[PDB]
DNA sequence: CGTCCTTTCGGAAGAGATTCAGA
DNA sequence: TCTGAATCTCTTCCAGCACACATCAGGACG
RNA sequence: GAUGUGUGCU
């Protein structure tokens, strides 16, 4: 290749070949002069060394360097490893009809949009829009077609509309670490250069917004439409392919919404009235006229389908707030109501998603999953729940925890001194002391502030759970635990050495006092201990998902039964304390091996081939057993590969 | 007392603790060293001397000649900083050595010499360092980042653990020398010493005992504490030193002078030692058969025949005790190898050695460093005594020999650079002291142990590595010598030199192109340790303990700033007050603590000098005097924290920032940050864009008035005086005549830097802050940099921040902004980009630039001017033509796609007998006369000043004033006058005129020549173009902003303003926030920031309504002094009586945005004092105010935290993120899409995603991936027909890139083919 | 220009190759 | 003094993506 | 186009 200039650009494979021909065509002039042995001896052995070096150049003792003193690429160095053949140009490869750019938010969209720029959709789909300004005569050759598109003239737009219609196009995030991390969206042309990402799938991707990008790539022919919507489009979904778990989870937002609506406060703007429906709620709330924490009589029907698949309607009067009646207005029919009957926090609205998807099926879950974000981030908003700094209270005791807690290493320290206690005791009673006095210190400022807002309740004065905001965006798990809710009001702890040994005198401060200059260098240890290690272990756990993906790589269903009376012996694990795993999560979804005996024994429960299911494993709970012969798929007799009896549940679908 | 541009806006300061020491120069680190490699050292050492005098006088192979160095100097640059910048070209210095060569004679070794020469030889051009630390290397401006590493000496490691798998800890003594080879020494599971070197492979290290020339006998001396046992009347006893007997078993009945002291079998007690010390008893009996288990010391022969009876080191019996008796052998001088304490690691290790003589252990040393080579004498001879012997092969140098003294616990620190016998001796003692369980072994990341070595040093070491390839070539040259014709440069060649200089500095690992996009980057880049680069470690093979932040890190190096990925912890940055020791060891101040007071003497302790005291805390309470106000106070001991009495300590730290670097010091509230969030911080921080309008952080930290000045982007006064002329585009101060010259006073003048275009494409600028007839002093800004206010660094802007969630448009960490904020255009930025055009003389004939463009409209041609290039202010687009390029068959120079741009500057090259194009020198036409305007200022304010002179000359003696400007400026010198020396001084006057004027005339003359130079281009090219077109960038949704609290996020709104929340009085906020951010990741010095923001604002809208309906001075006064005391006990104290009415009402005008609040890191603003400061505003003392919803009218349902943050733009732009991709061209040998954005190239579906659609089972979206939008040529545009003909179908083939894979195996001997 | 020429902060398998220590 | 088991060398691999710069046989004799 | 270096981002 002619580099930038009149010379030519280094090829190591030239270097090699000019190299093996030297010491080569030398070497038959001098078999031809009938030079004396030794010197054609080492004319020879230089041309095996030349040979050596471009077949496999290094395998040899030392590689030969041509320029920069790098060893020079041989022809055995392009076919492996990862700048190799294989790995680069021959399992995975650049691709046309892509882009990339940095994805927002787009709060608006459904599960199966995202929102393309309007820039990036008109070069990703140009030959679909040639062919177009060429079908409708709009234009008539390429020609004319592709300076139409370059001056984007007001006609490649709509024309850019339709050819955008029902197209899906993929979108993917850097590292795939599984397979939800591409899925197909329908685009929504959007102003901007962000494409913009709903919400409800950046927990499958890993994605946060706060710098990542995405990569759009469009399916051309017409099965990988048929896939990118049948196979990978975001609605099809919503469980987890590595175990029966839901995928769609509202987070940190929708779910502050929904829990501070679905909460009630003991007074309130109206308390006492019975409403009539959740429609009144909501005119109720909206007006002004109660508080959406009220604690209100309701008139709701909810359906429930106890018949053959037939909704049947009871019409109640519950006792709930004016939130959780202005929630019921878009929690589908099916439910029962004592689903949005409590204070939603992030576990209550997965499982009532989780619920709804098991009762209706996949399309009312899927409306169900964005009414659920819109009206949770709605009312998170109209909330202002926002984070002060009166808000990180410390207790009242965390001074005297403290200075009894110093007093007592005092008195250890003066035993020590008389001898009584040597180091090592001296060193785990001042541990042990410490860790106490920091679990006092969690206690009291966690009491302080669940328990804390008093609120007269129309008579004399009552308790009630706080409507502090970082206890509520904790208690919510929205976003926060009770580790970090401490380390920001508690005490911050035992810090640890870089080794792992715990520094004998704790922190004893948090982020709403300040640390010291000696107290916040004692951090950094840990701080920095668990980011060298998050950066160490990428590069680890890649290379395990790669070994894994390539050792089994082919295992296809390739049979639908084959026949075993084998399988495994499903226990549920137990290892000297609490059960591990119940029997249910271990057996659910795979089909039984031998006909499981009733514990009335010699009667059969459960047929030899039955794919369990939930209600079957509810039956294996009532009799009570706790052994069941259940076939697994190393017992399978298929041969390359798997029948699909001796695997079960898809557990996606 | 304040300072000039301090009195105009000064920052209120919240810190509590005074400040014993200032914050040193902040990039001193590349200046030192620089200025001492290149400076002129008499004694040698260190610099360009030390190169010099270490390798000449050189001589030849005695042929009586020599050339030795007389000195060296270095030349003028032919350019100077920014004329290399521009052309393109290094900004060096030639380096011209007055070398001699001495010629003695035939018989005359010490005689007179044959003949004497000298002269000074061009070895050499190397490059400068800029005023800043920087080097400019080919036009681009380079950091040479300090280095962090091993220093020379010996170090006994262990390997604990994971050998032998028996959890047996080896042990190691490796000696590393400055230049040379190692000498590992190491233990083998079964306790034998084996030596190696250069890591090569083990062989028992008394194979080098005896190649240093010693006998079995002399080593078993040299180790082994000797036994003596007796020949006597009978039963042999043995002499005894009672300590020996310290830890075992009784062997036998242990009796004195007949009476029993132990008992078979029995422990022997301290006791019973102690007893016998008391007794002093040393001959005791022994029985004979106990000694079956000893080894001998010295070899034994007989009296008689003098044959060998038991040479040294082999185990004794009953038939060897009779051999030694009947010969009559008294002494017998045996081992004593103690099981425990005094292991028998020597003697076994002999026991393994094959080689038996000197000679022996030479080969085997030769056979092991250069294998399958016939041995010799002198070959092996030779070369171990050039391993570690030899001065010219080997250096410890001044540090490695006094780690090596320090570590033996020798006394003198100086001594030999190379080994000696009892250097290595001495190691291999120490090594099995460490064995036997004396002794400890030392960290490798201890920062005792890691020097630091800076630019002053790997350049002088580069520049001896040119030297040594220099007299190679020399000594060889000087030996076929034609004598009496031969001047010291025939001999002499700078290409070493040259070539060695220009690898390092150019392309090497630490020589970096600066990070360069706001003040705050490019001086936490000078001041930054990399512990990678050449002669250290490296990311992937780097384990976790070098990444960890050792406790000797306090003070030196930052524990909170340091990148993220693949290298976190190899790349730290320097502390603020860190040093270098002369040595390169890290250290950093402490005041002294005398009897029970801090001293205000700072003592600079380094990492091993601080371990052995006890170091108060850095905030310790002091009462008036230094006495700490608590009896037991916190501090550190040995790496070790705890609290301790308050008389113990003996120094205390200096200040409360000293631990952090100093990106992590400008971090308002840096005490409440999380410190996974405060290096995010640090970082983010170090990546913001300097924005279309600087302004001032309300909340900093102190730090931003060094930051900002020691950076250099700003025109800092060189000496006081009056501003005299202020233009955009240059000031002139008239000095101070307490700080003129005696002679030609004058004034200086400062050439403003206009928009010119810095590394990362981004506008660097200065713009005066001073104004016409206004004072300034000393070392005070003139003119502000890129991102500076007022001399204060000011990386982003303050917005008013409202912490809510928000219809979830700040969903995970996005943020929304309003659209006031993009109509204010404060987050608009600059960014030129420089597009070149190069003119080749490719075949059939050269490429010239005319407009003459075939197959072109004339919209095209429409801008070029007639010469064919844009014209300067063309606002082009993307496809313009921007310069008219014609190949004989045509390559003219276009915009990119979607780039657009004003253009602001063309700019043409040429080299040499091309003889111009009008455009060529109407260009630069411009520069002669900005040279010119220069130049004439200066003469016309010296004969100004000349013709004062002639005229206070006339007003003594005859005064004429009337007279004497009537008739023109010439004739002024002899009116009515004597002819005194004032006339004589008149005369010398006129002729000094005439010399002016010619002077003046030469050196314009210089100046045109330097411009109008010939400025040779790369060979094969005519002539280079480079136009610069200038874009702005506003915000928009997708382009990060941060904090500087690690809170970053993607603007995922511009909301109309109308839309934003508003408060009760109607003003929308700027920006809205997540609250969800705060708690997960503790980084709640956001919130504090946020609500201090909020105080400062308060107080400068008090003063902005105050100053508004205009109220008297007295008010204004009496409210700012009120801000200014502000309750707790602070240190600010300023006092605005001492303002001067107007200084004060200046004061005000620049508050009226808000009141700078200062918080110094760890010494900052309290809550009690924030919410003080907020009842002094107006402002409710929660933070928390009551928002209303902009579209719906209504309250927010609970009071929201508003307040103001500085937010930051980072450059992660998204018009530079954006791409897109249908068809482009496609590779050449692997035919797939090309990559990145500049190509038009395609997003790389890697392997990673073939496996999530292999899982989804898309068999048809993977074939469709992998052949036809990719390598199969054939139907890859069957595709793009179908495509465009409205079907939608492939017919695929195979991918071009296997064939390419077959051909390439099959292109090896291997046979692999296609079947049937 | 044209043109000819020749060092050393890694951890597992596994494959020599030795050693050994044993009948 | 023929042989299974414990040490000794040396081989192979170690997450993905974008963007700046530099260097392209060059050294030297004709 | 290949390689290297460096920075950064996930
Ligand atoms: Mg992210
Ligand atoms: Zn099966």
Request: aromatic fraction near 6%.
């Amino acid at each position: 290749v002619p580099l930038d200039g009149g010379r030519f650009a280094t090829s190591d494979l030239n270097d090699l070949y000019r190299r093996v021909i030297n010491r080569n065509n030398r070497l038959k002039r001098l078999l031809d002069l009938a030079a004396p042995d030794i010197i054609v001896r080492n004319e020879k052995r230089m041309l095996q060394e030349a040979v050596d070096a471009l077949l496999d150049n290094g395998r040899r003792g030392r590689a030969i360097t041509g320029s920069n003193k790098r060893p020079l690429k041989s022809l055995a160095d392009m076919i492996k490893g990862k700048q190799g053949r294989f790995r680069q140009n021959l399992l995975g490869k650049r691709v046309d009809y892509s882009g990339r750019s940095v994805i927002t938010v787009g709060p608006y969209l459904r599960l199966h949009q995202c929102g393309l720029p309007k820039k990036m959709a008109l070069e990703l789909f140009k030959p679909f829009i040639y062919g177009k300004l060429e079908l409708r005569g709009l234009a008539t050759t390429i020609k004319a077609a592709k300076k139409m598109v370059e001056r984007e003239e007001a006609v490649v737009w709509d024309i850019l509309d339709e050819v955008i219609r029902e197209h899906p196009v993929l979108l993917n995030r850097a590292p795939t670490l599984h397979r939800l991390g591409i899925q197909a969206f329908e685009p929504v042309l959007i102003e901007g250069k962000a494409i913009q990402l709903h919400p409800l799938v950046c927990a499958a991707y890993n994605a946060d917004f706060d710098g990542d990008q995405m990569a759009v790539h469009v399916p051309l022919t017409l099965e990988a439409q048929l896939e990118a919507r049948a196979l990978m489009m975001s609605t099809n979904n919503i469980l987890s392919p590595a175990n029966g778990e839901p995928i769609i989870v509202p987070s940190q937002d929708v779910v502050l919404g929904l829990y501070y609506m679905t909460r009630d406060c003991v007074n309130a703007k109206g308390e006492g009235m019975v409403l009539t429906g959740p429609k009144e709620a909501e005119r109720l709330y909206r007006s002004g006229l109660a508080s959406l924490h009220a604690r209100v009589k309701v008139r709701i029907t909810e359906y429930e389908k106890d018949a053959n698949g037939e909704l049947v309607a009871k019409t109640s009067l519950k006792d709930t707030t004016v939130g959780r009646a202005i929630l019921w207005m878009i929690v589908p029919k099916g439910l029962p109501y004592s689903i949005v009957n409590q204070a939603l926090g992030k576990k209550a609205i997965s499982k009532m998603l989780n619920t709804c998807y098991r009762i209706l099926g996949l399309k009312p879950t899927v409306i169900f999953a964005d009414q659920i974000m819109y009206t949770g981030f709605a009312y998170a908003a109209r909330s202002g729940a926002s984070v002060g700094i009166d808000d990180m209270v410390i207790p009242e005791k965390k001074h005297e925890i403290i200075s009894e807690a110093e007093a007592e290493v005092a008195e250890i320290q003066e035993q020590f001194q008389s001898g009584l206690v040597t180091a090592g005791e001296r060193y785990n009673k001042v541990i042990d002391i410490w860790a106490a006095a920091n679990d006092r210190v969690s206690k009291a400022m966690m009491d302080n502030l669940q328990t804390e807002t008093v609120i007269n309740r129309d008579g004399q004065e009552e308790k009630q759970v706080s409507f502090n905001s970082i206890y509520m965006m904790a208690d919510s798990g929205a976003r926060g635990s009770a580790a970090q809710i401490r380390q920001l009001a508690g005490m911050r702890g035992l810090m640890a050495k870089p080794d792992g040994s715990i520094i004998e005198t704790p922190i004893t401060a948090n982020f709403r006092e300040g640390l010291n200059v000696l107290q916040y260098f004692i951090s950094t240890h840990g701080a920095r201990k668990g980011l060298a290690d998050t950066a160490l272990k990428t590069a680890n756990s890649g290379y395990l998902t790669r070994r894994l993906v390539d050792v089994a790589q082919d295992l296809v269903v390739t049979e639908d039964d084959c026949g075993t009376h084998e399988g495994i012996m499903m226990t549920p694990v137990i290892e000297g304390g609490d059960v591990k795993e119940p029997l249910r999560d271990r057996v659910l979804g795979r089909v039984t091996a031998e006909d499981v005996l009733k514990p009335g024994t010699a009667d059969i429960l459960v047929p030899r081939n039955t794919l369990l299911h939930e209600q079957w494993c509810d039956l294996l709970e009532e009799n009570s057993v706790d052994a069941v012969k259940v076939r697994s798929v190393v017992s399978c007799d298929t041969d390359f590969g798997v029948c699909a009896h001796c695997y079960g549940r898809d557990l996606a679908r | 007392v304040y300072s000039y541009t301090e009195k105009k806006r000064i920052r209120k300061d919240f810190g509590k603790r005074p400040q014993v020491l200032d914050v040193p120069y902040l990039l001193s680190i590349q200046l030192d060293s620089f200025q001492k490699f290149i400076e002129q050292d008499p004694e040698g050492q260190y610099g360009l001397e030390a190169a010099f005098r270490s390798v000449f006088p050189i001589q030849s192979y005695s042929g009586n000649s020599e050339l030795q160095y007389v000195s060296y100097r270095l030349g003028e640059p032919v350019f100077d900083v920014q004329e290399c910048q521009i052309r393109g070209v290094t900004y060096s210095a030639p380096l011209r050595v007055k070398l001699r060569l001495v010629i003695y004679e035939r018989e005359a070794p010490e005689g007179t010499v044959k003949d004497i020469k000298e002269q000074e030889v061009y070895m050499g051009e190397i490059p400068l360092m800029t005023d800043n630390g920087t080097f400019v290397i080919n036009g681009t401006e380079r950091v040479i980042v300090s280095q962090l590493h091993r220093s020379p000496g010996v170090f006994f490691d262990s390997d604990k653990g994971k050998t032998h798998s028996s959890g047996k800890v080896l042990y190691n003594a490796r000696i590393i020398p400055y230049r040379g080879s190692w000498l590992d020494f190491e233990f083998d599971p079964k306790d034998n010493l084996f030596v190696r070197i250069d890591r090569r492979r083990k062989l028992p290290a008394t194979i080098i005992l005896r190649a240093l020339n010693y006998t079995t006998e002399q080593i078993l001396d040299l180790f082994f504490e000797k036994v003596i046992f007796e020949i006597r009347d009978n039963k042999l006893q043995m002499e005894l030193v009672p300590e020996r007997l310290r830890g075992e078993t009784a062997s036998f009945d242990i009796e004195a002078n007949g009476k029993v002291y132990v008992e078979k079998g029995r422990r022997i007690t301290a006791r019973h030692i102690r007893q016998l010390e008391k007794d002093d008893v040393k001959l005791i009996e022994v029985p004979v058969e106990y000694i079956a288990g000893k080894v001998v010391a010295k070899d034994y022969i007989d009296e008689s025949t003098g044959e060998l009876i038991c040479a040294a080191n082999m185990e004794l019996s009953l038939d060897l005790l009779a051999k030694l008796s009947q010969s009559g052998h008294k002494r017998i001088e045996t081992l004593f190898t103690n099981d425990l304490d005094h292991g028998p690691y020597i003697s076994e290790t002999l026991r393994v050695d094959p080689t038996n003589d000197r000679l022996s252990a030479l080969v085997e040393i030769y056979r092991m460093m250069r294998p399958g080579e016939p041995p010799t004498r002198e070959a092996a001879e030779s070369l171990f005594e050039n391993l570690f012997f030899s001065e010219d092969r080997y250096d410890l140098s001044a540090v490695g020999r006094m780690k090596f003294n320090r570590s033996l616990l020798r006394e003198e620190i100086e001594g030999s650079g190379i080994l000696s016998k009892d250097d290595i001796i001495d190691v291999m003692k120490k090594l099995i002291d460490i064995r036997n369980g004396k002794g400890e072994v030392d960290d490798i990341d201890h920062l005792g142990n890691r020097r630091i070595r800076s630019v002053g040093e790997m350049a002088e070491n580069q520049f001896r590595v040119g030297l040594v390839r220099v007299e190679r070539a020399v000594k060889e040259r000087l030996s076929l010598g034609d004598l009496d014709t031969l001047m010291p440069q025939d001999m002499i060649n700078a290409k070493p030199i040259s070539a060695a200089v220009k690898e390092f500095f150019g392309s090497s690992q630490l020589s970096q192109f600066m990070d360069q996009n706001n003040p705050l980057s490019e001086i936490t880049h000078k001041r930054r340790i990399s512990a990678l680069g050449p002669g250290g470690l490296t990311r992937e093979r780097a384990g976790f303990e070098v990444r960890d932040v050792h406790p000797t890190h306090y003070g030196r190096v930052c524990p909170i700033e340091t990148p993220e990925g693949p290298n976190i912890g190899l790349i730290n940055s320097l502390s603020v007050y860190a040093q270098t020791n002369e040595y390169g060891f890290l250290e950093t101040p402490y005041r002294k603590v005398t009897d029970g007071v801090v001293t205000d003497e700072i003592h600079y302790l380094s990492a091993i000098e601080e371990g052995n005291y006890v170091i108060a805390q850095a905030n310790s309470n002091l009462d008036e005097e230094g006495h700490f106000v608590e009896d037991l106070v916190t501090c550190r001991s040995k790496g070790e924290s705890s609290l301790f009495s308050r008389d113990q300590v003996d120094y205390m730290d200096v200040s409360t920032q000293q631990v952090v670097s100093v990106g992590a010091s400008l971090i308002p509230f840096l005490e409440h940050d999380d410190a996974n969030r405060a290096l995010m911080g640090a970082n983010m921080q170090r990546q913001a864009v300097p924005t279309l309008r600087a302004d001032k952080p309300l909340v900093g930290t102190g730090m931003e008035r060094a930051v900002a000045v020691d950076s250099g982007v700003t025109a800092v006064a060189k000496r006081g005086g009056v501003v005299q002329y202020v233009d955009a585009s240059r000031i002139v101060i008239k000095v101070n005549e307490d700080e003129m010259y005696p002679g030609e006073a004058g004034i200086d003048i400062y050439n403003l830097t206009k928009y010119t275009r810095s590394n990362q494409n981004t506008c660097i600028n200065q713009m005066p802050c001073v104004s016409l007839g206004e004072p300034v002093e000393r070392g005070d800004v003139l003119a502000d940099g890129p991102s500076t206010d007022l001399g204060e660094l000011a990386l982003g802007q303050n917005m008013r921040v409202a912490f809510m969630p928000w219809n979830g448009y700040n969903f995970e960490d996005s943020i929304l902004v309003s659209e006031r904020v993009v109509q204010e255009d404060r987050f608009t930025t600059i960014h030129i980009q420089e597009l070149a055009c190069v003119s080749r003389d490719t075949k059939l004939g050269p490429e010239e630039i005319t407009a003459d463009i075939p197959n072109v409209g004339e919209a095209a041609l429409s801008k070029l001017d007639e010469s064919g290039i844009v014209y300067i202010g063309a606002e082009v687009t993307g496809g313009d033509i921007l310069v008219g390029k014609v190949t004989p068959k045509d390559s003219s120079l276009r915009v990119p796609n979607g780039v657009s741009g004003t253009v602001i500057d063309v700019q043409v090259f040429t080299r040499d007998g091309v003889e111009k194009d009008k455009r060529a020198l109407e260009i630069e036409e411009m520069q002669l006369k900005q040279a010119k305007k220069d130049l004439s200022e200066e003469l016309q304010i010296l004969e100004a000043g000349l013709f004062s002179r002639i005229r206070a000359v006339l007003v003594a003696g005859g005064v004429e004033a009337e007279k004497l400007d009537k008739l023109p400026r010439d004739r002024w010198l002899e009116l009515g006058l004597t002819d005194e020396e004032k006339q004589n001084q008149l005369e010398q006057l006129a002729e000094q005129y005439d010399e002016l004027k010619h002077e003046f005339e030469k050196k314009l003359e210089a100046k045109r020549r330097k411009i109008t130079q010939g400025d040779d281009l790369a060979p094969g090219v005519l002539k280079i173009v480079k136009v610069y077109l200038a874009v702005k960038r506003r915000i928009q949704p997708g382009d990060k902003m941060a904090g500087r609290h690690g809170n970053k996020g993607v603007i995922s709104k511009i909301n109309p303003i109308e839309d934003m929340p508003y408060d009760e009085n109607g003003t929308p906020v700027d920006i809205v926030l997540n609250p969800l951010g705060v708690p997960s990741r503790m980084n709640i010095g956001q919130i504090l920031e946020t609500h201090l923001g909020m105080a400062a604002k308060g107080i400068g809208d008090k003063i902005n309504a105050m100053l508004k309906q205009q109220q008297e001075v007295a008010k204004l006064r009496e409210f700012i002094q009120r801000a200014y005391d502000l309750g707790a006990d602070v240190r600010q104290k300023v006092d605005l009586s001492t303002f001067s009415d107007e200084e004060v009402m200046r004061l005000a005008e620049n508050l009226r945005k808000g009141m700078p609040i200062a918080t110094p890191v760890f010494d900052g603003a309290k809550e009690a004092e924030i919410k003080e400061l907020l009842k002094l505003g107006d402002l409710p003392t929660s933070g928390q105010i009551r928002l209303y919803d902009g579209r719906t009218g209504e309250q927010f349902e609970r009071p929201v935290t508003v307040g103001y943050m500085y937010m930051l733009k980072l450059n992660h732009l998204v018009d530079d993120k954006m791409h897109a991709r249908s068809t482009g061209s496609y590779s050449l040998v692997t035919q797939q899409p090309l990559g990145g954005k500049a190509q038009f190239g395609g997003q790389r579906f890697g392997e990673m995603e073939v496996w999530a659609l292999e899982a989804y089972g898309a068999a048809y979206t993977l074939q469709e991936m992998l052949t036809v939008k990719s390598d199969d040529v054939n139907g890859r545009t069957k595709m793009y027909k179908n495509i465009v003909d409205g079907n939608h179908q492939m017919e695929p083939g195979m991918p071009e890139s296997f064939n390419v894979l077959l051909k390439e195996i099959r292109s090896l001997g291997i046979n692999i083919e296609l079947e049937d």
